[PDB]
Paper text:
Homogeneous refinement of class 1 followed by local refinement implemented in cryoSPARC v3.1.0 gave a resolution of 3.6 Å, and local refinement with a mask over the PAS-GAF-PHY-neck region resulted from a resolution of 3.4 Å. The modeled structure shows the signatures expected for the Pr state, including the PHY tongue in a β-sheet conformation and the biliverdin in 15Z conformation. The structure of the PAS-GAF-PHY domains is almost identical to the crystal structure of the corresponding truncation of [name]. The cryo-EM structures presented here are free of these biases. They firmly confirm a head-to-head arrangement of the dimer for bacterial phytochromes and indicate that the bent conformation of the photosensory core module previously detected in Pr crystals is the one that is present in the solution.
Phytochromes are a protein superfamily in bacteria, plants, and fungi, and function by photoswitching between states that absorb red light (Pr) and far-red light (Pfr). Conserved over the entire superfamily and exemplified by the phytochrome from [name], phytochromes share a photosensory core module, consisting of PAS, GAF, and PHY domains and a bilin chromophore, which is connected to a variable effector module via helical linkers. Many bacteriophytochromes are histidine kinases or phosphatases in two-component systems (TCSs). For the single-particle cryo-EM experiment, we used a fusion of [name] with its [name] protein (abbreviated [name]-DrRR) via a 12 amino acid tether.
Residue numbers in the entry:
A (entry chain B): 7 to 130, 138 to 519
B (entry chain A): 7 to 106, 109 to 130, 138 to 519
């Protein structure tokens, strides 16, 4: 639930109440364009940006109280065709204008409810080569390099980087291209507090936003409330939408003049950003932004292709080792024997230190394992767990009672044959020395200050109770075992009923 | 395995030996450009198209025996950067030239060789991209595509052609000129698009025929002297069309062709296929626009299909959720999955059902006679996977072609493995009429060349049923997991029964 905005009457936003900021309703725009709201039926003007009078070059007595039919005679018929009543608010329409007072204008329109938002901005063979270059990258780190070079070339920005999210919403810079004699942010990881959750929800909907100037003063809308609904006007799909005042402070301390980002969306989920900085105030032309929007879409396809090629490659190293195992667990009638032979080796398939088997109603260990009573502690925890696969790199965090059992078991991968964890397998990876290079500060040191942090330098933190993280192609290998074992469970039942049959008869 | 080409010494291609035609090595180009092959290291010219002398406007004594350094001084450095040794042959590079009019040069590398293609040259795409992303369903998306493509290209007919899992295609959307025939809805055999052609159209994603009544222009010398072998022209756009397919478009009465491949998750999904009545040449800078749209579509197909399934499966929400709870605590499936209060016949819109647990079978609804049940089950045990899905049973199993009245359609899942325990939904026989565009699959192997008729043809199909909506197959595979999942509890219990009866 969001707090009301400042103009209506709401509380002051700090680091504590961050999630509850109405970013999508600022009631203000960035001062390098003009904004008009009109009725989606009559064509009568309802709101103006305060700067619109001069930018379009007319007396505001005339603008307030006029039809879109009289202002844009060539466009108003064309506009009503493209955006019919009851259309998604993500749908946009663009056209170019020859306004004599200014010169050349680029008009961008979209519909929200019974309302039209109008955005005005001044305006005036490599993309084909770039598209073909992305499709012929070998791996993923190769694809991310081609992206950053290509974007820096077109835009002429100081720094361009590809920023990728983890499943816990802390991001990592995976590739970077910059000007010479500058700091390097590559490899650095960042907390889940820099990008709030409602902002992540927005960046899945609309796929581009920017800040032309970080030291700019915002321009209000008049009248401030939409008189149709007597409510604040939603500016989510508007590009001239003023930036959140909190984030503006952040870019000042990092010492940035201008920002831009394009969202990468894989299968209806936010995957990462392409984030650009410049040292000085800098305005990108609107016809160049369009090129960036195509590249965002091309990437969103090629991310899928390269990731699925990385897994298939890895899993072709473990081919014969997989195939002999799969044959041995498909004819097993006693798993406590066939899955314990060192001649098969289940420790090497997963590159694990130890293993805990559990079938029938007992348990048996291979390799390097915790002491005996501590095994029964671990298993007791797994029975409460929801799914059919539990995967962790740090065990001490998920389970604090087993934070002392790091030397043998820091890492864990567990699969449940059948359901309920009556029967399972558990691979164990030992403790490792870990050093994570945080860009700025650790997650605990992001909630101390009333505003953003000052330091953005390379920070080293020693993490304890961590292990070697699981390659995704190994998790895919495990889930294929989990199927074979659960599959041949039917034969096991079959037999025992026939045993039961005799012993009922006796 | 392919036959050798005509110039080396191979057999004449007919309808019998179609799969064995070397399409990717014709040794000829379409006469509206020029083609040069050069060494990828020295830059020395090795092959010319016979028409190249005049098109580029030079004496062929000069062209043969020259460097690319002397011909394109501004390009030769730039070209060696873009295409390094050992790069995929799908990678392309383009640039524009001011030849005393204007030329568009397109280059790609195959092995130790460079292919050069020459062609003459001289705000809506942004609107189209946004319109595709805001389409409600799939048939709505396919309509936006066909309108948008007809507008830019100005072609007579544009249509989206989608493949079935058996490689017979169906026209799902269409936009055309007025006073013309309508191909929409018509289905076509798996013999019109051969299999090696399908293999090619997954690699390179555009091809065209500028003129159907054109004579092909040969290459000189005809064999690449580097390898003493025919020069591969797969990635070349000026590549001459197969002579068989040229005959086909003449009988359909087409002047010019173009197609763009739609590729979903490393598989061919469909084509965008365009015709014109007269010879017509598309400019190269307009083709580039079409190539972007092909890529945009290939993403949006995925989004709209996954939205169609999720929509359907939200109608069957409570009916699914009650069932899933009942088969997760079952200790006797022969009881809990037989109550009409649960109803498994309605979840799948089926006429009948055959259950099988323990070691016997029990039926609900409308089912075949008793000895014929044991015929059907005997067949399922030989079947490979864990799900068998068919609309026509008589084709997959000819011994049960007589059991159409009760069981024309089938969907069977195997709890566990081996078909010891399974469930089988049955759909009854239905009157079916399929509108073939031209002729049926049996009437495509008679003639020595292509067919003449392309009119609406009606065939009465017998032994067919209502086909399964994909959201129903997704519903079935989620049951197959619950039943197999709770098999563990079933075993657990019986061992403890066994425990007592061992003790006695
Ligand atoms: C090296 C990589 C890197 C990182 C990790 C990074 C983060 C980052 N923040 C972003 C946005 C926002 N952040 C906050 C708020 C807070 N964030 C904090 O730190 C505290 C003080 C806080 C609240 C108490 C809000 C409200 C917004 C939404 C702004 C709007 O849409 O109006 C964006 C997207 C915008 C863009 O691309 O320029 C990025 C990419 N900036 C970098 O360059
Ligand atoms: C209304 C829908 C409709 C259909 C179904 C249709 C067919 C069709 N076949 C295509 C291609 C080829 N066909 C054949 C050969 C044969 N075709 C036959 O019928 C028999 C005689 C036969 C061999 C025994 C060969 C070698 C090729 C490869 C061409 C090459 O790449 O050189 C293409 C794609 C190319 C394009 O769009 O132009 C289409 C779209 N034309 C339509 O517009």
């Amino acid at each position: 639930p969001f707090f009301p905005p400042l103009y209506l009457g709401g509380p002051e936003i700090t680091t504590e109440n961050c999630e509850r900021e109405p970013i999508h309703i600022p009631g203000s725009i960035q001062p390098h364009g003009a904004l008009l709201t009109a009725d989606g039926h009559s064509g009568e003007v309802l709101q103006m940006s305060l700067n619109a009078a001069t930018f379009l070059g007319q007396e505001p007595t005339v603008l307030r109280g006029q039809t879109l039919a009289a202002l844009l005679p060539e466009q108003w018929p064309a506009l009503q065709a493209a955006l019919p009543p009851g259309c998604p608010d993500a749908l946009q329409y663009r056209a170019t204008l020859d306004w004599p007072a200014a010169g050349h204008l680029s008009l961008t329109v979209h519909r929200v409810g019974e309302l039209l938002i109008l955005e005005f901005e001044p305006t005036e063979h490599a993309l084909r080569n770039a598209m073909f270059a992305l499709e012929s990258a070998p791996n993923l780190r190769a694809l991310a390099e081609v992206a950053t070079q290509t974007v820096r070339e077109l835009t002429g920005f100081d720094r361009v980087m590809l920023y990728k999210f983890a499943p816990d919403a802390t991001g990592e810079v995976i590739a970077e291209a910059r000007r010479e004699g500058l700091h390097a942010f590559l490899g650095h990881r960042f907390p889940a507090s820099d990008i709030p959750a409602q902002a992540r929800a927005l960046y899945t909907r609309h796929l581009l936003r920017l800040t032309a100037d970080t030291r700019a003063a915002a321009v209000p809308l008049d009248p401030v409330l939409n008189p149709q609904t007597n409510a604040p006007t939603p500016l989510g799909g508007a590009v001239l939408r003023a930036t959140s005042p909190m984030h503006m402070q952040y870019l000042r301390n990092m010492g940035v003049g201008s920002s831009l980002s394009v969202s990468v969306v894989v299968g209806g989920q936010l995957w990462g950003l392409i984030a650009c900085h410049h040292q000085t105030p800098y305005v990108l032309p609107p016809d160049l932004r369009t090129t960036l929007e195509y590249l965002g879409r091309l990437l969103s396809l090629q991310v899928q292709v390269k990731e699925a090629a990385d897994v298939a490659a890895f899993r072709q190293s473990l081919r014969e080792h997989h195939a002999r195992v799969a044959l041995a667990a498909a004819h097993s009638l006693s798993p406590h024997d066939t899955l314990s032979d060192p001649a098969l080796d289940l420790l090497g398939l997963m590159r694990a230190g130890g293993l805990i088997l559990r079938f029938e109603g007992r348990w048996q260990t291979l390799g390097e394992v915790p002491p005996a009573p501590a095994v029964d502690a671990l298993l007791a925890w797994l029975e409460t767990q929801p799914g059919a696969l539990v995967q962790t790199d740090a065990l001490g965090q998920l389970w604090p009672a087993g934070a002392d059992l790091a030397p043998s078991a820091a890492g864990l991968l567990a699969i449940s044959v059948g359901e309920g964890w009556s029967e399972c397998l558990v691979w164990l990876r030992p403790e490792l020395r870990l050093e994570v290079a945080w860009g700025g500060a650790t997650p605990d040191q992001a909630k101390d200050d009333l505003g953003p942090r000052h330091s953005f330098d390379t920070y080293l933190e020693e993490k304890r109770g961590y292990a070697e993280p699981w390659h995704p192609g190994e998790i895919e290998e495990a889930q294929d075992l989990r199927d074979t074992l659960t599959g041949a469970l039917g034969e096991r039942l079959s037999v025992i009923r026939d045993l039961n049959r005799a012993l009922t008869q006796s």
